[PDB]
Amino acid sequence: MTEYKLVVVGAGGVGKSALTIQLIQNHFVDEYDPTIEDSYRKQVVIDGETCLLDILDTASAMRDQYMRTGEGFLCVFAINNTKSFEDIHQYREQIKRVKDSDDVPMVLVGNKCDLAARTVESRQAQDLARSYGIPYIETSAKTRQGVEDAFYTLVREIRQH
Ligand SMILES: Nc1nc2c(ncn2[C@@H]2O[C@H](COP(=O)(O)OP(=O)(O)O)[C@@H](O)[C@H]2O)c(=O)[nH]1
Ligand SMILES: [Mg+2]
């Protein structure tokens, strides 16, 4: 089967761990240690292909290896965290430097869409993603809305690469 190496990046507290755990365990974690960085594996069928997703949940040699060998990146912010959205540029710049390219498979993810506090509008994020030439997808690690879409879209972006 085909392996896809995915890396989840973004500011502390945006839901990188929650998203990853939702994808694998179909459960929402309230209080996952903010310092645990690890890789997780999930066998899936995506568009009729048996895939192994090798996912690094960032929070170190392991990070360097995945940043270098990672095929695609979820850049996550939370829709109730303006700073995390503003920080996205830094994560994008980092990925471009480590890949020496501005054409890297990536999806911009606006997490916590279940919350009534939104301080980042969908259109602001759409605009940023358009500027980078990538998709924008909103998610909730709590309700599972958008979660498969975000990860599976990242796979469909790697396939175009
Ligand atoms: N309501 C809501 N809370 C979320 C969501 N995703 C994460 N959280 C909460 O946000 C906090 C940070 O999540 P975590 O996954 O640890 O963030 P990380 O630092 O990016 O790994 C925790 O209290 C989570 O329960 C979401 O989609 N909705
Ligand atoms: Mg975490």
Residue numbers in the entry: 1 to 59, 65 to 166
Authors' text:
The three human oncogenes, HRas, NRas and KRas, encode highly related membrane-bound Ras protein isoforms that act as “molecular switches” cycling between GDP-bound and GTP-bound forms. The GTP-bound active form has a high affinity to downstream effector proteins, such as Raf, and triggers the mitogen-activated protein kinase (MAPK) pathway. Tyrosine phosphorylation on Ras by Src kinase is known to uncouple Ras from upstream regulation and downstream communication.
To gain atomistic insight into how phosphorylation of Y64 could influence intrinsic GTP hydrolysis and nucleotide exchange rates with phosphorylated Ras, we initially assessed the stability of phosphorylated Ras. We first crystallised the apo RaspY64-GDP apo structure with commercial crystallisation screens. α2-Helix adopts a conformation that is highly similar to other GDP-bound product structures of Ras with an angle difference of <5° degree.
